[PDB]
Amino acid sequence: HHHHFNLPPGNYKKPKLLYCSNGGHFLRILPDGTVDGTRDRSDQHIQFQLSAESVGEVYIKSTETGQYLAMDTDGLLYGSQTPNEECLFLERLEENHYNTYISKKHAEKNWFVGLKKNGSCKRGPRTHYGQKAILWLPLPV
Numbered sequence: 001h002h003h004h005f006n007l008p009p010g011n012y013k014k015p016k017l018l019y020c021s022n023g024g025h026f027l028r029i030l031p032d033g034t035v036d037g038t039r040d041r042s043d044q045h046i047q048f049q050l051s052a053e054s055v056g057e058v059y060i061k062s063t064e065t066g067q068y069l070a071m072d073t074d075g076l077l078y079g080s081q082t083p084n085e086e087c088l089f090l091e092r093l094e095e096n097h098y099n100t101y102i103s104k105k106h107a108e109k110n111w112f113v114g115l116k117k118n119g120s121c122k123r124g125p126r127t128h129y130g131q132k133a134i135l136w137l138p139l140p141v
Helices: none
Strands: 016-020 025-029 035-038 048-052 057-062 068-071 077-080 089-094 098-103 136-140
Touching (some): 016 048
Antiparallel strands (some): 016 025, 025 035, 057 068, 057 089, 068 077, 089 098
């Protein structure tokens, strides 16, 4: 392992919203596969169903479009129609409170799922431990 194994409490029984502490945005995957953040709580594309592959490994799937959150070879997030190796994330506790999601594929590079204060996605290499951009709070739908 290249990372710790402090896991967050909670389960995957129900869908959730993923709120980024940084700019207070909800993660969003639009129909065309575009990923970004929005403050609009009434958005129909901010609801996600998380599921565990192995302990601590998860898929993040849009309940509205069925698209899986994924990070490509150059670190950009995108919505995938089918589950693949780029869709697996290491879900961990951070700052004893928040949830972080590390690309499994690029875990050695410490590429995280994260949003900038303006709600745009951070590219893998631009993320790192210590940033507010990578801190998530899972909320009930």
